[PDB]
Write a protein that binds this DNA or RNA. Structure first.
Ligand SMILES: [Mg+2]
Ligand SMILES: [Mg+2]
Ligand SMILES: [Mg+2]
Ligand SMILES: [Mg+2]
Ligand SMILES: [Mg+2]
Ligand SMILES: [Mg+2]
Ligand SMILES: [Mg+2]
Ligand SMILES: [Mg+2]
Ligand SMILES: [Mg+2]
Ligand SMILES: [Mg+2]
Ligand SMILES: [Mg+2]
Ligand SMILES: [Mg+2]
Lengths: 155, 82, 205, 129, 80, 123
RNA sequence: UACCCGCAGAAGAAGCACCGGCUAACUCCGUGCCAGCAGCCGCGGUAAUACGGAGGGUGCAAGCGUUAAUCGGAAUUACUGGGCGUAAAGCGCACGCAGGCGGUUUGUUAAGUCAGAUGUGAAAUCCCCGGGCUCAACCUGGGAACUGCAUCUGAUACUGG
RNA sequence: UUAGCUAGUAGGUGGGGUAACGGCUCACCUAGGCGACGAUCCCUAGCUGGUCUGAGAGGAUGACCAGCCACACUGGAACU
């Protein structure tokens, strides 16, 4: 019922006394389509084995995101080691406007309308981390209402 | 020499003469004082193709402006038909 | 400014029936659908994200017989209009005369619709039009010419109109070979095999 | 030297929130008390009290909710090296209306939401979220 | 109801006329920092009652020389 | 930097440098071959690349590359040159246009004919 | 003249680029680090999907490509919106004029700041709602916009005097 | 990697001159005037509404259409 898709696959190497030892890495994102999204990173000698490992890694380490209506509550800015991510909620019907890694993360999470831009490095492993960081730190008016002790007359 | 004239606009074979008061030494489509109305020679017969601002024309004519022949014809036909 | 090459190569490339043929016969019997055109049509290589977006765009263009420049103008018109870009684009593609003539069934396909519209054999509100991509306003009446009334192909398409599923927003009178455009569709009547979302992000790269 | 005491105020809240301090203390001023009043009316701080006469000191009692700081991000916009003033129709909306922007207008120091309905606009002192 | 400008005088060495400098704050068009410019205007004056530095009221008038087009109205500072 | 520093000295914009200065904003430029010869490419390429020293109409002497199979560019032949560098040739920053002026199209060419000035075969 | 009608017959009407990856689309023959290709990485020294041809396909279409030029992507001059221990980047150190900035309270001013109004901000253009060329481009009515400037009246929290 | 520039030059009286104010001009008087908020000198350039691009800020640009300016083989002058 939940959706899963593969971000990128990369071949890595570890040289030994005999020579190189080739390996394959898989970055995947798993989301239920509501705002519960996670990512998994796995390593294996074979591409099917590597992608499978990332699949179970993503089912654990799931997070929850509070969405308004298929979109973000407010503009959000997610920063990881070398990647800067700016996402802001857009109007209905505008669709998803984001880079490769961010679009997959966003679409499996369940955000249909969003304007998202990536600054800094565009390494898939780090932009996915930055995107997850933004969806965390974004908040909901009811949790803010309890946070400030001011009820929900703000909106 | 202040005159109320027709400035030709619109595409070719479909004129959209533009009634405007202007100094007579300016170009036909050049600088003007103030737009007054329009006149559409196509005359589609489904919707009105002419609307003129008669009160501004009066403020100009009775002050010392001048009417061209076509604009004068427009004034008389608008009055008789409306 | 049209397509003149083989018809079912288009239906083959996107792998689905594109209604280019009249439908008097089974499309499977007429041609092998599960194969792509060409000597490599045996293989089905892994198609990328850009590939699937392009295939969706080309699928819509080949259903409606519209070229790329025309279609890009429709998208800009769709994006300018208030509402949602995906079904706005689909709504313009419906209002073309080819589609409305074809959908009301005076032409077996858009190509008969194209001949009928472009050969001055279609009147709208009693006015003769021969432009394929003339938008149809709601409450407009499209009828066959009295000269064109006595041609075999038009009456032949009326039976195929029944053979397929009737459009709810078009009211036809085959007794005098006429039809009425009550209003535009709402994207709930149209086929769901068209993913209009991919179109927006193809043209919004 | 000391050239932005309002920036000092905002930094003390931020550092107190990060370090989970119950209270902060800092020399008082009229604009400082006005900003503290705005935060108190808005629900971002527990309570402020002014003590002393020759050298006043604001003792602010910070606020917490579960294990997280109440103030996600507090920052200064108008600064001594760059003054920022905004009109009525260009007041910013920090975090789409779920945060506040302290605004010094002619009537008094107050939030953007209240200034936008009073129809004043003015200087943008701080963003609180 | 008459258009007037403030300033402070910078020189009075020339006779029957003074130079005044109008100060103003203007937003920088690009960087948004309030910089201050200066508008040094030559101002005609009778009786030579403007010194150095004293604030001055001036008004635009008809041209009186090559560079002078402004005249005194009132003075509000005196005796350094 | 600081806003004050930026008011004193604004952001200087990077000045863009053309890769084909001898064209000087012209799509093509006419010249005459002042020398026609072949030169070896830098490694890891190995060939006999057909090039020509050409003096242009604006007095800019520059080398250009003769694309395609077979040319009849003698010395002093007047041709048209266009932009485009040959990577494995240091300094050869222009391509000769085939099918224009004295330069002739590549014979027995059936694909990409417009890029080599080859008329359609009478078939 | 647009336009309308009558005539005869599929009869007068499809090309260009590309197919190694970036990027949609693959095989065979020739050739053998040669000929050549190439925007970037690069390909070719005997199974070359990268060269030349041919079949197949793809994209656009009365056009298609190449070159030139502008902006974008380039947050790659970063005002919005960047950095300076080691990647480029903290003056060898200090004093100091101009300049930039400035603790805290009261009064006053109203220069910055903000609110209102008035006059301007030509038309065309751009945008919105319509109208007319059979559609469209095109033309066109009204509106919005041009929130920039100037003046007058007012507010005094912040900055300045 | 242009730091000083100015002698009708800056101002005043008086005469003349212009449709009109004005060193516009002349005689005399004073020693002023501009400049690091870039004077002076050097290179380039018609300006604008707009156009192209950009999410915006902005960057490039000023062909067609409209406003203004300046020129009419080169230099100068007046006449009507
Ligand atoms: Mg065309
Ligand atoms: Mg930039
Ligand atoms: Mg950097
Ligand atoms: Mg080093
Ligand atoms: Mg270093
Ligand atoms: Mg040091
Ligand atoms: Mg102070
Ligand atoms: Mg004021
Ligand atoms: Mg206008
Ligand atoms: Mg004199
Ligand atoms: Mg010039
Ligand atoms: Mg940008």
């Amino acid at each position: 019922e939940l959706q899963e898709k593969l971000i990128a696959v990369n071949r890595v190497s570890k040289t030994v006394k005999g020579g190189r030892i080739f390996s394959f890495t898989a970055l995947t994102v798993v989301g239920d389509g509501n705002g519960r999204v996670g990512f998994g990173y796995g390593k294996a000698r074979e591409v099917p084995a590597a992608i499978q490992k990332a699949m179970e890694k993503a089912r654990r380490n799931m997070i929850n995101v509070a969405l308004n209506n298929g979109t973000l509550q407010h503009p959000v800015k997610g920063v990881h080691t070398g990647s800067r991510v700016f996402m802001q909620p857009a109007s209905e019907g505008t669709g998803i406007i984001a880079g490769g890694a961010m679009r997959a993360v966003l679409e499996v999470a369940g955000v249909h309308n969003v304007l998202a831009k990536a600054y800094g490095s565009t390494n898939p492993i780090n932009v996915v981390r930055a995107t997850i960081d933004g969806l965390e730190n974004m908040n909901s008016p009811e949790m803010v209402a309890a946070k400030r002790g001011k009820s929900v007359e703000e909106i | 020499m202040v005159t109320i004239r027709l400035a030709r606009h619109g595409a070719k074979k479909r004129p959209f003469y533009q009634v405007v008061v202007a100094d007579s030494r300016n170009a036909r489509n050049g600088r003007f004082i103030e737009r007054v109305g329009f006149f559409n020679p196509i005359a589609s017969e489904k919707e009105e193709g002419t609307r003129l601002d008669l009160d501004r024309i009066a403020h100009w004519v009775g002050q010392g402006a001048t009417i061209s022949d076509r604009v004068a014809a427009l004034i008389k036909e608008v009055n008789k038909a409306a | 400014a049209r397509y003149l090459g083989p018809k079912l190569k288009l239906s083959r490339r996107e792998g689905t029936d594109l209604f280019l043929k009249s439908g008097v016969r089974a499309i499977d019997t007429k041609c092998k659908i599960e194969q792509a055109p060409g000597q490599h049509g045996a293989r089905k290589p892994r198609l990328s994200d850009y590939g699937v977006q392009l295939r969706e765009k080309q699928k819509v263009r080949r259903i409606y017989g519209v070229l790329e420049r025309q279609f890009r103008n429709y998208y800009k018109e769709a994006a300018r209009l208030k509402g949602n870009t995906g079904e706005n684009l689909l709504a313009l593609l419906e209002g073309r005369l080819d589609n409305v003539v074809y959908r009301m069934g005076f032409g077996a396909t858009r190509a008969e619709a194209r001949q009928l519209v472009s050969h001055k054999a279609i009147m709208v509100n009693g006015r003769v039009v021969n432009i394929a991509s003339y938008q149809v306003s709601p409450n407009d009446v499209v009828s066959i010419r009295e000269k064109a009334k006595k041609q075999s192909r038009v009456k032949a398409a009326l039976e195929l109109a029944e053979q397929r599923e009737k459009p709810t927003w078009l009211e036809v009178d085959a007794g005098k070979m006429e039809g009425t455009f009550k209003r535009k569709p709402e994207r709930s009547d149209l086929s769901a095999d068209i993913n209009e979302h991919l179109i927006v992000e193809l043209y919004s790269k | 030297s000391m050239q932005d005491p309002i920036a000092d105020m905002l930094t003390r809240i931020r550092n107190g929130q990060a370090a989970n301090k119950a209270a902060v203390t800092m020399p008082s001023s009229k604009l400082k008390v006005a900003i503290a009043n705005v935060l108190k009316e808005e629900g971002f701080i527990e309570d402020f009290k002014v003590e002393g006469d020759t050298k006043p000191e604001l003792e602010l009692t910070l606020k917490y909710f579960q294990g997280k700081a109440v103030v996600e991000s507090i920052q200064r916009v108008s600064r001594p090296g760059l003054r920022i003033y905004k009109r009525k129709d260009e007041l910013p909306k920090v975090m789409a209306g779920l945060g506040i922007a302290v605004v010094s207008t002619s009537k008094g120091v107050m939030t953007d939401r209240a200034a936008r309905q009073a129809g004043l606009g003015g200087e943008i002192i701080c963003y609180v979220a | 109801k008459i258009r007037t400008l403030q300033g402070r005088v910078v020189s009075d060495k020339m006779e029957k006329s003074i130079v005044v400098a109008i100060e103003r704050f203007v937003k920088h068009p690009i960087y948004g920092k309030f910089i201050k410019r200066t508008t040094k205007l030559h101002v005609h004056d009778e009786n030579n009652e403007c010194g150095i530095g004293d604030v001055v009221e001036i008004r635009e008038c008809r041209p009186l020389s090559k560079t002078k087009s402004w005249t005194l109205v009132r003075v509000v500072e005196k005796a350094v | 930097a600081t806003v004050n520093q930026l008011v004193r000295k604004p952001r200087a914009r990077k000045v863009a440098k053309s890769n084909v200065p001898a064209l000087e904003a012209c799509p093509q430029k006419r010249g005459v071959c002042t020398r026609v010869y072949t030169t070896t490419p830098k490694k890891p390429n190995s060939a006999l690349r057909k090039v020509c020293r050409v003096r242009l109409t604006n007095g800019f002497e520059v080398t250009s590359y003769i694309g395609g199979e077979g040319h009849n560019l003698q010395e002093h032949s007047v041709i048209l040159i266009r932009g485009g560098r040959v990577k494995d040739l240091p300094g050869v920053r222009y391509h000769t246009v085939r099918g224009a002026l004295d330069c002739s199209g590549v014979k027995d060419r059936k694909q990409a004919r417009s890029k080599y000035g080859v008329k359609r075969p009478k078939a």
